[PDB]
Ligand code: HEM
Ligand code: HEM
């Protein structure tokens with residue numbers, strides 16, 4: 001049983017089933033599978049019992065679990081993702097106060113709406129693809145929502161630099177570029193925070209830029225302008241990432257013309273309202289569940305413990321299959337069908353323990369992604385925006401199909417689109 | 421407009437509304453009110469803008485703000501409460517390192533659980549009241565958590581002497597007793613610290629008692645053994661104080677039997693454990709929010725400045741309404757309702773700017789209480805303990821009712837309780 005790192009690069013999102021299959025575990029089963037990867041023992045876990053385990057901070061730490069080749073360029077150095085104990089709780093608290101606050105999310109809903117409404121018209125003259133153009137639109141919204149005091153081009157630059165990062169870090173032949181993207185982005189963010197603290201750059205006192213500039217650590221000292229800038233990115237770039245979900249959502253619409261028209265009816269019955277449309281939210285939630293984005297979640301093991309008969313080791317790495325539980329037939333009724341009706345029946349996605357496309361457990365007391373609201377706020381607005389008639393989504397093979405073996409995958413074209 | 425010191429003694433916790441009312445200010449309003457008290461100009465402030473102001477250490481000093489009749493017996497002479505500038509930052513750092521460290525809080529959580537679990541069993545044989553008996557239990561836990569090397573009698577003795585202080589100070593006809601209590605406690609603590617420094621009494625090297633005996637100031641010199649004992653009390657006595665919150669919490673249970681049964685279910689699932697129960701924790705925070713303990717906070721003014729049109733001058737004393745802000749309908753959804761559900765929606769109480777029952781600014785860089793963790797840890801453990809069925813809280817008028825004109829008020833009986 002050699003190291004499974006070559007298999008992970010080869011299989012991509014098929015790696016979870018592959019290790020499951022190559023271990024003799026039945027299909028659709030939740031049985032833990034133990035295998036070596038990255039020169040160490042690892043156990044892939046999947047299921048509701050796995051989610052409760054993954055977030056038991058008494059047995060599961062996170063620092064060092066994500067390899068630096070990924071955490072380095074994507075999340076940045078010293079980010080909230082690599083923190084445990086008190087230092088994390090104080091950092092999440094200050095960050096969930098901006099992305100998880102219902103008031104600030106509703107403010108973002110207005111920013112992302114206006115930016116999208118422009119594109120749908122903007123495309124009519126210079127059409128493009130969803131992934132690239134919506135990434136800029138998402139970045140413009142997140143930056144304006146944060147109070148970033150930069151020009152429009154600078155906003156679009158950083159937006160594409162963040163979208164370029166997400167496209168490159170996952171491919172072994174491009175991870176070197178994602179390091180250059182972060183190096184540039186880290187410098188632009190640090191300079192911004194440095195000028196806010198110096199008064200050269202004055203921002204709104206309640207803005208996200210200000211709360212980042214006045215960020216402090218667990219010992220009560222204010223973080224370095226770099227870290228304050230790294231963490232500002234971790235509140236804007238993960239929004240630019242949603243353009244990949246917008247691409248996936250665009251494919252599902254041309255594949256499900258019935259639900260696409262319901263959204264349309266909804267937005268039509270609301271005259272342009274692209275936000276807070278329960279139908280588009282359900283479509284956005286269904287896209288997050290079915291389509292591949294985050295393959296699995298890595299975590300370290302604090303002490304010798306056990307999960308469902310399979311024993312796991314101290315200092316071991318566990319992996320939570322997020323694609324497998326989100327589509328496990330054990331936990332979902334017909335997971336093969338793209339059906340946003342399941343998220344109109346249960347709108348509170350936090351009650352679904354097995355719905356973990358962006359994390360499980362609690363968001364305030366754990367590492368679960370804050371701003372799933374902000375993500376869906378952006379994602380649902382795009383579903384409503386493309387639900388129109390003047391918009392016709394191109395359906396070439398490179399527009400509708402994506403590779404399951406490619407990490408951070410997406411339709412080749414980025415899902416092209418044209419508007420009349 | 422005569423001096424308002426007689427009105428404060430007469431009105432108690434209604435004094436803030438009284439000064440608000442006698443100034444023509446509308447009800448529930450946040451308008452500052454200026455009046456003379458203690459032979460000097462004073463301005464009562466209330467609201468989020470007041471909390472940010474009150475802790476702007478660029479405009480507000482604190483030494484001399486608390487009259488010696490209160491600071492003297494309660495906090496002790498030369499305590500961290502009377503410190504400004506650098507000398508405070510050096511002292512808080514060494515003191516918040518014991519009460520604000522999440523690891524040490526979890527250690528105290530086990531002690532307060534063990535001590536509370538005993539009381540409910542003693543009550544079966546010899547029942548009493550919440551205020552007095554839980555004060556001893558809180559003191560027994562806080563002393564053992566700190567590493568106090570004393571017998572059971574001294575632990576029980578100093579604890580009741582500490583609870584006696586809180587009941588006696590603030591009462592004009594009893595403040596003389598709290599001076600005698602402090603003189604006794606100061607001497608017992610000083611003797612303890614002196615024998616720890618001499619090796620006559622050996623304590624755990626990382627215990628709170630040791631970090632107090634090795635306390636140093638801004639001078640780089642270790643504090644006098646007495647002061648190390650005053651500051652040791654300011655990390656054990658304020659825990660004995662929570663028995664007043666436990667008394668208030670006991671009334672709220674017989675007043676809200678639904679949340680009481682909600683906690684009961686919670687503990688039953690936790691297999692007896694009384695700590696880290698999210699339901700009991702939420703119940704504990706609402707008790708701290710609704711019930712009167714700390715009326716207002718006085719502070720000195722460094723330079724002439726302004727708050728919402730009202731000018732305040734140098735050398736003035738400002739008062740931050742903590743009961744008025746914690747129950748202002750402007751800042752809370754139905755603050756008249758006792759609803760721990762509001763603290764399940766937002767568990768991070770430090771993100772709530774208007775929730776200031778034990779301070780409002782930052783705890784590490786300000787004067788905010790560092791024992792809010794330890795406090796709720798103790799208070800919620802009692803909330804879980806009384807949620808059982810064998811526990812019957814007496815509901816006579818002197819058990820359920822407390823005076824709002826009395827300082828450091830509580831039901832007269834202390835909320836009596838009997839268990840089968
Ligand atoms: C494309 C949509 C997004 C996806 C797929 C996603 C996914 C994730 C995942 C899987 C985690 C780790 C959860 C865990 O550790 O259990 C995470 C963490 C995080 N996400 Fe997102 N996210 C998205 C959007 C956002 C947005 C819009 C924001 C805020 C602007 C955001 C902010 C964060 C933060 C701050 C963390 C760190 C949490 C912690 O480690 O304590 N994400 N994200
Ligand atoms: C009954 C519950 C408690 C209440 C109502 C309470 C209230 C307060 C208040 C209002 C302050 C001043 C905040 C400010 O200056 O803005 C304070 C300070 C302080 N408290 Fe408490 N407290 C409680 C429990 C505790 C506990 C359990 C501890 C630790 C064992 C503690 C230790 C301290 C210390 C050391 C300070 C000084 C902070 C400073 O002035 O820099 N308190 N408390």
Ligand SMILES: CCCCCCCCCCCCCCCC(=O)O
Pocket residue numbers: 008067070074075166237238239241293294295296297298
């Ligand atoms: C062999 C290690 C694999 C472990 C897990 C695979 C890492 C892929 C996870 C993708 C993270 C995507 C985060 C989106 C938001 C952001 O821009 O930060």
Ligand SMILES: CCCCCCCCCCCCCCCC(=O)O
Pocket residue numbers: 428487490590657658659661713714715716717718
């Ligand atoms: C006339 C001046 C009045 C100003 C405010 C009144 C002072 C009463 C506040 C009581 C403080 C109680 C603190 C409990 C915890 C501890 O033991 O430190």
